[PDB]
Design an enzyme around this catalytic site. Structure first.
Site, PDB file in Angstrom:
ATOM      1  N   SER A 299     -19.556   5.903  52.622  1.00  0.00           N
ATOM      2  CA  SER A 299     -20.727   6.523  53.535  1.00  0.00           C
ATOM      3  C   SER A 299     -21.773   5.296  53.904  1.00  0.00           C
ATOM      4  O   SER A 299     -21.164   4.505  54.464  1.00  0.00           O
ATOM      5  CB  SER A 299     -21.326   7.713  52.610  1.00  0.00           C
ATOM      6  OG  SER A 299     -22.934   7.268  52.008  1.00  0.00           O
TER       7      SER A 299
ATOM      8  N   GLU B 126     -15.402   9.501  59.689  1.00  0.00           N
ATOM      9  CA  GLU B 126     -15.675  10.502  58.825  1.00  0.00           C
ATOM     10  C   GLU B 126     -17.054  10.667  58.824  1.00  0.00           C
ATOM     11  O   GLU B 126     -17.929   9.838  59.380  1.00  0.00           O
ATOM     12  CB  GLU B 126     -15.414   9.859  57.248  1.00  0.00           C
ATOM     13  CG  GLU B 126     -16.066  10.201  56.123  1.00  0.00           C
ATOM     14  CD  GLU B 126     -17.393  10.149  55.911  1.00  0.00           C
ATOM     15  OE1 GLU B 126     -18.051   8.959  55.425  1.00  0.00           O
ATOM     16  OE2 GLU B 126     -18.141  11.250  56.045  1.00  0.00           O
TER      17      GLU B 126
ATOM     18  N   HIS C  24     -16.525  12.845  52.881  1.00  0.00           N
ATOM     19  CA  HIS C  24     -17.440  13.441  51.811  1.00  0.00           C
ATOM     20  C   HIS C  24     -16.804  14.691  51.127  1.00  0.00           C
ATOM     21  O   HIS C  24     -17.808  15.400  50.563  1.00  0.00           O
ATOM     22  CB  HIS C  24     -18.769  13.840  52.564  1.00  0.00           C
ATOM     23  CG  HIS C  24     -19.478  12.675  52.840  1.00  0.00           C
ATOM     24  ND1 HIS C  24     -19.632  11.732  53.832  1.00  0.00           N
ATOM     25  CD2 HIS C  24     -20.463  12.024  51.987  1.00  0.00           C
ATOM     26  CE1 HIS C  24     -20.538  10.897  53.763  1.00  0.00           C
ATOM     27  NE2 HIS C  24     -21.079  10.772  52.597  1.00  0.00           N
TER      28      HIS C  24
END
Lengths: 327, 325
Positions: free
Chosen positions: A114, A231, A299
């Site tokens: 992330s 993502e 995630h």
């Protein structure tokens, strides 16, 4: 090639934990022990950066402090790998203040995902050290369904051979940090082929809107000859995913993108096949290249670990459609 | 740096839909909004494709580009108002004929996602554009009065002006329920950092402006007054990261000043986090910064020029003065 592959992890190797985004204060104390015991059982010595426990009103620490912990980790020759505590929003604050000469001289594994995308990418582009989008330290505190995560962590960082990025049997979208016991495991329908084809390329990716943060800066990687691994999390909606992608595909090199692989979206984002299709379809840079979705990264759980600056081959006709080559 | 001539009674305004379809507006609000510009003495016309709606509540790139080109092409069109915001006006940027635009200076006004369009148009043609009311803005039954004045101050006249804190402000979906509004005493502006500054005014929506980064549309930031803003989807940490990314763009070392729009309530911005956010931004050191300006996703909203100019005196009563526009 040019890209440096750091030494692979072996038994007895020291692993340093640093908090470049959110402070480890965010984690319950006993969740920390879960992760420590998993990493130790796997053969590793776990140690923590001086400032990890420090916490401010953004639930992070100061710049001065994060850089110091990073510099100490790279500088300490006993440290064979660096794992980040957990993601956040703010690792991009650090980019100007890092000693890239230091880093470039001390190549070693650096792993997280992330928000860590910003940090791992800048390191890749400034030093040519291959870095990793993959488990955080906190990732190892998840009680259930950890197998895939470890297997893949190992495939990527405990051995040299190329490896398939394989579909998990079951995935979930859970807040497992709040509730470890009540998990909802969904049979995995597999990779969906959005556009067919075969391609190979440099791996660039991680979190879409985080990677956009590098745009216009000296840290932005060129996109030509890449397989994009992208993502994004629950905060994204399909229309924001689309602007972020459009913007990304306006960066230098965008016209020579080789392929794309997309991580499973969290359920909140409500990304239907129809919308995804329409988003891909209206992007010029994605014309007639292979595009796959539903991959295990992003995630949801579980997540694989893949190199930034390593290489991959996509083949949509094969059983294993994604192959990690240089890692 | 060119300038669109001001609306004069009787002038044709074109309504275009570069992000979301007019098909998201209540039909009767299009009627409401259409009465107002008409009482303000303007003839109102619509692009052919404003009613088209796809699965994103937007329309094809080709459609939106076509409407933009006929709006500039048409010498009788004196002003162009976007229908409303969205997420996708950035898909249009590579397809615009900037030559045609440069040769038909006129007023383009919108806010939110329209920031992408207006900024590209300014940085490619040097045509000054506006972050201000939508067409839809004028469908708002009540509390419309400041919107009118500010707008009028900017697009109906040539004189400088200032940016009055509004008497009352709100955060309400007034297109869903027009009658039940919760208006509020404005605590007004807030000096985050003191000082005086003049320079070029840049960019409305923060996270939108971010999308221009790395492309030939990104305006240089040297000698600039940043008026920034973001909607409820933003939280302090994302706003902070977006800010951090903008302040790393070319010329950010030379920013003269910053004005920040009132946040929506769901964002949950606080004095303390707002401050922690400023202090930690290098590029902002020892220049003026102000919170609580009236623009962004609150109501009412001003209309200011993108590429026009502003003076910020923290030492004064009216701290924000718009000069060129």
């Amino acid at each position: 090639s040019n890209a440096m592959i750091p030494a692979k992890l072996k038994q007895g190797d020291e692993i340093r934990i640093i908090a470049p985004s959110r402070s480890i204060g965010i984690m319950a104390d006993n969740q920390v022990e879960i992760a420590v015991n998993r990493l130790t059982d796997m053969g590793f010595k776990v140690t923590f950066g001086e400032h990890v426990a420090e916490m401010d009103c953004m639930m992070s620490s100061s710049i001065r402090s994060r850089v110091a912990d990073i510099h100490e980790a790279f500088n300490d020759s006993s440290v064979k790998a660096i794992l980040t505590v957990i993601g956040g929003f703010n690792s991009n604050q650090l980019l100007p203040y890092l000693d890239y000469d230091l880093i470039s001289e001390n190549p070693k594994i650096l792993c997280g995902f992330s928000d860590i995308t910003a940090l791992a990418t800048a390191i890749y582009t400034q030093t040519e050290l291959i870095t990793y989008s993959g488990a955080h330290f906190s990732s190892f505190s998840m009680e259930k369904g950890l197998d895939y995560v470890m297997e893949s962590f190992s495939d990527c960082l405990l051995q040299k051979e190329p490896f398939a990025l394989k579909e998990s049997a079951t995935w979930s979208d859970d807040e497992w940090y709040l509730d470890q016991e009540n998990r909802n495991f969904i049979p995995n329908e597999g990779l969906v082929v959005m556009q067919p084809g075969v391609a190979e390329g440099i791996i660039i990716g991680g979190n879409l809107c985080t990677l956009n943060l590098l745009q216009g800066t000296e840290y932005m990687p060129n996109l030509a000859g890449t397989i994009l691994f992208i993502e994004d999390d629950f905060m994204t909606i399909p229309e924001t995913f689309d602007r972020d992608l459009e913007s990304l595909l306006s960066q230098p090199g965008a016209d020579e993108i080789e392929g794309m692989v997309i991580g499973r979206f969290q359920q909140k984002t409500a990304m239907t096949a129809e919308k995804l299709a329409y988003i891909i379809e209206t992007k010029t840079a994605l014309q007639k290249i292979p595009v796959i979705s539903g991959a295990d990264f992003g995630h949801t759980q579980p997540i694989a670990t893949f190199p930034i600056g390593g290489t991959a081959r996509i083949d949509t006709n094969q059983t294993d459609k994604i192959q990690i080559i240089r890692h």
